Ligand binder design. Structure first.
Ligand code: B12
Ligand SMILES: C[C@H]1O[C@@H](n2cnc3c(N)ncnc32)[C@H](O)[C@@H]1O
Ligand SMILES: C[C@H]1O[C@@H](n2cnc3c(N)ncnc32)[C@H](O)[C@@H]1O
Ligand SMILES: C[C@H]1O[C@@H](n2cnc3c(N)ncnc32)[C@H](O)[C@@H]1O
Lengths: 453, 251, 453, 453
């Protein structure tokens, strides 16, 4: 396998695969802060070409973190279908990209092919894709899951109700839930980022969420996005179980940073099967995002694109109901501006769909990054056309608690009516009986939370 | 003029306007399944349904026909029977077909080898003609093979109204290290000759599971021929004595 | 709970829950042979009535085999969703019946309700159900799975191509495969019952099936229904894996009789995941049938319906692609005539659909039983209305090796064209491109196996 | 023409056609009681083969009852289109069976071909048909008639309201009519089997039926199934005319047993044209059933299948609105158990459709026959898939008067929703305005007769 190429008469040589995976990336401030970024456009291009010419086996047999040392490498390599892998092992990344993009490749063809990839292979393809490549490639890879609603069917668009209060006051939380339901938000989940981490608080938050759910017989599910070990305990203890959440990183040391062992995730799966109020088979919820391993010092010289891909290959093992990157959640040290928050939100979603997970995206940015709310509206629409399974919702996307801006409840309603998409069919059926939605559009009386009173 | 029992009736190609009629004839002779009989819309053709129902008329008859007591002795055989008295109650009470009567359990020890090393047993099971058609071809050359060199050959004997689990008793009563059972399988539609062997090593009534047996099925002129079957059984017998295990637990 | 009821002023006392279930069964020769049957048609209705007033808990807490002594009782009980249980623990078996039968009960209502059930509770409902209750109720409970074909979609009807042989001769097997495909049969599985049980014979048959599959690129999957250990070693040694089959029983002594441990079922999942050519997520295949637990002395005084329903609570743990009963495979001692065999067909399918498994049925009979081929056509069509996921298929129904008669290839075509049902959509597209099918109907050239040449 | 064949080397010879028509039958207790039944399966099969090899002319020129002696033979032979007959006269019954079953035969092809048959030829085909042959063959032969509702369109399913009281009390009769209408029953007819035979009683029964009809402007028609000469008189006299009913037998002596001359039927046709309140062109209603000629000693050595076929060839001359066999109405001396009541209900319906009449079936059994209500639910569904034009309805199918069990009002509603079929479009339009039915399903407020109050 070449690690070198000649571009304009000058020879471009690279040390290993990890470096070729890194410099091929589009320019972001994260790979600069990590020392893995290319020196220029030419060596970036040179890295893509050497990367495009490496085979699947080249990248599958060269994980950024070795097998014996990282239990996420272990999990990814162990879940490979070696039969699907051996069919494709000698394809160059440049033929895998053209196979994924081909209109002669079916959803069922991809369903077997993706079984023979490893997360690093997913990242490779994403690296040599234009932004239209990432959108159109992901669109032809739908991932459908079911809980108490069905998410991911082409022609639908879900949204998660994010009602975060600076005190987890249950009136502030209630109030935004009534606001969101009135715009058609909440079919992905009504999910709460808690300001605390105590059991008696979640039960309070869950019993508030589920009081509304039970009162209006809402087809959906609740969540409070505390640590998984507190969630498990609050539900083993009598709080209503919907989804079970946990943030994840793409390395063992990254999971330890969060306090997470893979045994905790197995336990969440088993707690869900005995306790949770879920009709479907998918009940887990993970969140990801470029720059978490680099923050944790758990990236090991690998770039935030490849490490983010290991997130999805990890998630795919637990078959969660939903996954979403939080694209601009941390700040400009990993992704600086609009150009990079878009490109990464396209890379992420594409990577998640190729790994076979119900990939949404929190289209968002922070106030110390070079961005504004027009960036959220650009990205949500592009990701919608890519068939992104869900985005977030908050009143004007203003998180009074986590101090970032996400997408409004207006913005899901806009995408659905701009692109003629519907909610989860079950959630849509409920909104129609409540008079909030007719023919995928808001009624006149919609957007008014006092409707529930 | 057509005899639905005739070879030409069984060699009948019903396909109208075929893509490759020669290919049809090669598929019809490549199998005994009722391929290539064509269709009338989504339904079978009349003659194929006729040969099916005629073949079913015959197969039902073979169910309740018994082997003579005169045939068993013209074969010079100890005949013993289960707790079942006739063919009707046999079909409905498997638990008595897996058990020997009282005069049974004493004619065993009185008249046959003590603790043999192979005990060969023959029963009609679910088809008499599985036993009569293939006997002279399987049982004699079988019996020679175990004698060379082996092997305290247990004297053979026939079990009327017999089931497969009754060999667990025979293996204890007789104390045989290995038991072989030639038994009639349920009648097919096109033939009832099919014979099977169930063979177990040091059977137990308390302990032996169905998995502990080795099974050889479709011993007949259309399946495994009885001459070759016999050579395969004694070799199987040679291996259970080496390994001291049967069926599932063999290597 | 009462074990006692007055009917026409006559007292009927029953010892335990085990007796009530057994005597509530409609008359079948296997229960008689098992000594559990009611002695009078008046005693039988009494068992129905006391059963109808027992609750879910009464039956959940009274399996016919105790938890400590049976790993199948453990699997069934350990897998209960206990929140879904507590909601219905106090409903009568009369109310679960009416709840299932209700058109105000949606498929997502049942999706959660069924997780609070155990197989004894499943069998309870079935015994107070008429033939029509079993057809209608099973119909509104679709179970959809996917391998490389999708099965169970309402409005579809699959068929297993069952090409058997007295010598496992591969030219004979291949002859029956072209026959089957020519009639649109095979979207369920191309499965061969072997007459031997060695790997080398098994792998030779698999090559024959998959050679046909590869040559015409058929969307389907091959199987050789040997013992599960022999399939695993054949696939480990490089033979193409499709489905992985094992005959199953509803008690630990029943499994032992077969030589099966649950860890082999856990291993077949892992072997399929690493090896098997399956685009979708379901790979395992089980077969069941009333009278198998009593044939092994492994029913412990329980009736053959209750024990067959535990087959389903077991198989649901491993979420297989297809399950089916071989309804009259054994003989008249267990199921006697038409009446009893149709009745068993409707029971097994309904309980399987209530169990959340992909329930099909081998509509079959043996020659020493009081039945004929008109019986199969009666029940094949009754189950197609009930949305039975698949039936078998052989030329004219004549198995030359298993020495029974099942459904013809013609019968799947008849059902489909009679009830306006399609094959698996993946498979239907293939028959269209093969000129075998158009608008769900066989073409003029269909039914000719010489068409592949 | 052969009357002999060789089966398994043994020669099977038969005396005439009447015998070959008889022994070819599937085994029923009726042909045993008539001495016409085969000695075994082999001679049964042998009879089918000789029968399959006889031509149309063979059977057309050999009526079971001679021309000069029987005015039903006369009527059947006289209504033959000799042009259609001469096209087919030299086809063997085995080619007529494959022509009827062929997907290359259209409804319009059959419409001319059936004109050249005689009832005995219809019976012959039915004799060499499997049960799936009978179902699929009849499905592709729809017969559509019109009265005040349209019956027989594929995708619809009618039902007759049978409100029979032990005193013809008009409150008991009213009460079950309100019960049935509430389930969607009555589009075939609201038909009364009277316990009396006096004119002043029918007028009472008719004026009760039509008071409800007129009050809710029900699209349908009434009937009281007395003798036709009383019906004619009650309507000539001022009672409201709907359908005119008469039971019929397949021989002159069988009609005399009932008190019926063919002149009475001509008179019913003429009374209907001057008096009856029918929008459409079809207003007559006959009922049939295997074993009526044998009861009357009017079968003449012919079997109950062939004699039943002469029923339809007789009915076809008067172009009635509806005909239905009463399959298990008499008792076990003609049809003993489930196997025979199903097989005959399939034979009957198939035969009626081949003769070109609006063939329904009273799926029913008696309490001294070897049967139960699960037999009614098996047969109604199989006959529904065969496109049976209507079945009966009573509360739980319990006839408090004629002391047999028929099908419930529930059972028509079940078939319609199991098979996604609708009532007569006119009757469906009325049920929708009454709120009883939406989208072919019962509303929540359906099945409650106090709805009409
Ligand atoms: C009916 C039948 C069964 C029935 C037995 C129920 C019953 N009481 O009748 C059921 C459905 C349980 C069954 C199960 C299996 N069977 Co099976 N079965 C048959 C069949 C069609 C007829 C047997 C027969 O008529 N015997 C004669 C009568 C008189 O004996 P019996 O005492 O009434 O029946 C006993 C035996 O037949 C025995 N038995 C039945 N099948 C098998 C399989 C094996 C390997 C053994 C050791 C014993 C055994 O159990 C019965 C009760 O004790 C044969 C096919 C054939 N051509 O014979 C296959 C057959 C014997 N079975 C076979 C197989 C593969 C199996 C399974 C292992 C399938 C699986 N993957 O799990 C299982 C497990 C068997 C076990 N461990 O007990 C193969 C054997 C291949 C071989 N070379 O050994 C055969 C040849 C055909 C087939 N592919 O199904 N089977
Ligand atoms: C907003 C919520 O989303 C989760 N979250 C945000 N960004 C990431 C990331 N890169 N990786 C994992 N989880 C993340 C955190 O758990 C936080 O609570
Ligand atoms: C046709 C194949 O299906 C399997 N089979 C048949 N009947 C049953 C049953 N009741 N239980 C389990 N497996 C069964 C047998 O193993 C046979 O080989
Ligand atoms: C139930 C009603 O149906 C009619 N009926 C029942 N069975 C038959 C038959 N075999 N032939 C003619 N009419 C019949 C009778 O007239 C009775 O009144």
């Amino acid at each position: 396998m070449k690690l070198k190429t000649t571009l304009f008469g000058n020879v471009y040589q690279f040390k290993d695969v990890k470096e070729v995976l890194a410099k091929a990336n589009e320019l972001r401030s994260g790979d600069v802060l990590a020392g893995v970024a290319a020196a220029s456009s030419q060596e970036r291009v040179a890295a893509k070409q050497v990367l495009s010419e490496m085979t699947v086996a080249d990248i599958r047999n060269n994980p950024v973190i070795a097998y014996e040392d990282d239990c996420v490498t272990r999990l990814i390599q162990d879940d490979v279908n070696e039969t699907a892998y051996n069919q494709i092992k000698n394809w160059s990344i440049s033929e895998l990209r053209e196979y994924v993009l081909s209109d002669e490749t079916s959803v069922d063809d991809i369903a077997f092919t993706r079984k023979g990839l490893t997360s690093e292979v997913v990242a490779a393809v994403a690296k040599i894709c234009s932004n239209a490549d990432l959108i159109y490639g992901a669109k032809k890879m739908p991932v459908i899951k079911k809980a108490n609603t069905t998410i991911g069917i082409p022609g639908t668009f879900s949204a998660r109700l994010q009602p975060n209060d600076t005190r987890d006051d249950v009136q502030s939380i209630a109030a935004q839930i009534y606001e969101g339901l009135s715009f058609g938000v909440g079919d992905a989940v009504i999910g709460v980022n808690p300001v605390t981490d105590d059991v008696e608080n979640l039960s309070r938050v869950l019993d508030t969420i589920y009081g509304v759910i039970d009162k209006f017989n809402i087809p959906t599910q609740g969540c409070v996005l505390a640590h998984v070990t507190t969630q498990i305990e609050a539900i083993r203890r009598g709080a209503p179980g919907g989804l079970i959440f946990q943030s994840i990183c793409g390395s063992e040391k990254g999971l330890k940073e969060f306090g997470v062992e893979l045994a905790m995730l197995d336990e969440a799966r088993a707690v869900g099967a005995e306790f949770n109020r879920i009709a479907g088979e998918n009940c887990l919820y993970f969140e990801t995002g470029q720059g978490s391993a680099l923050s944790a010092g758990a990236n090991f010289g690998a770039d935030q694109v490849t490490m983010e891909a290991r997130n999805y290959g990890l998630a795919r093992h637990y078959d969660p109901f939903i996954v979403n990157t939080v694209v601009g959640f941390i700040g400009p040290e990993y992704l600086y501006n609009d150009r990079q928050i878009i490109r990464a939100g396209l890379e992420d979603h594409f990577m998640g769909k190729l790994s076979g997970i119900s990939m949404g995206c929190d289209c968002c940015y922070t106030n110390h990054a070079d961005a504004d709310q027009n960036l959220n509206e650009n990205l949500m629409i592009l990701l919608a056309t890519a068939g992104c399974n869900y985005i977030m919702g908050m009143p004007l996307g203003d998180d009074i608690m986590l101090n970032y801006q996400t997408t409004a409840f207006h913005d899901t309603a806009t995408v659905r009516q701009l692109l003629n998409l519907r909610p989860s069919p079950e959630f849509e059926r409920w909104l129609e009986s409540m008079g909030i939605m007719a023919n995928g559009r808001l009624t006149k009386r919609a957007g008014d939370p006092s409707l529930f009173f | 003029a057509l005899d639905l029992g005739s070879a030409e009736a069984k060699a009948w190609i019903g396909v109208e306007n075929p893509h490759r009629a020669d290919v049809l004839t090669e598929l019809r002779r490549s199998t005994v399944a009722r391929v290539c009989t064509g269709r009338a819309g989504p339904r079978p053709r009349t003659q194929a349904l006729l040969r099916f129902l005629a073949d079913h008329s015959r197969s039902k008859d073979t169910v309740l026909k018994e082997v003579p007591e005169e045939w068993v002795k013209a074969q010079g055989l100890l005949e013993v029977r289960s707790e079942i008295s006739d063919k009707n109650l046999y079909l409905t009470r498997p638990d008595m077909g897996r058990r020997l009567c009282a005069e049974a359990v004493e004619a065993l020890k009185a008249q046959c080898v003590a603790n043999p090393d192979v005990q060969v047993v023959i029963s009609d099971g679910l088809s008499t003609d599985a036993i009569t058609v293939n006997y002279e071809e399987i049982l004699p050359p079988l019996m020679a093979g175990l004698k060379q060199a082996g092997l305290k050959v247990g004297t053979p004997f026939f079990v009327r109204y017999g089931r497969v689990k009754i060999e667990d008793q025979i293996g204890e009563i007789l104390g045989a290290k290995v038991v072989i059972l030639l038994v009639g399988e349920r009648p097919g539609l096109g033939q009832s000759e099919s014979l099977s062997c169930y063979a177990v090593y040091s059977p137990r009534m308390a302990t032996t599971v169905e998995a502990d047996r080795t099974c050889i099925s479709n011993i007949h002129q259309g399946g495994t021929p009885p001459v070759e079957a016999a050579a395969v059984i004694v070799d199987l017998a040679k291996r259970m004595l080496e390994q001291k295990a049967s069926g599932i637990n063999m290597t």
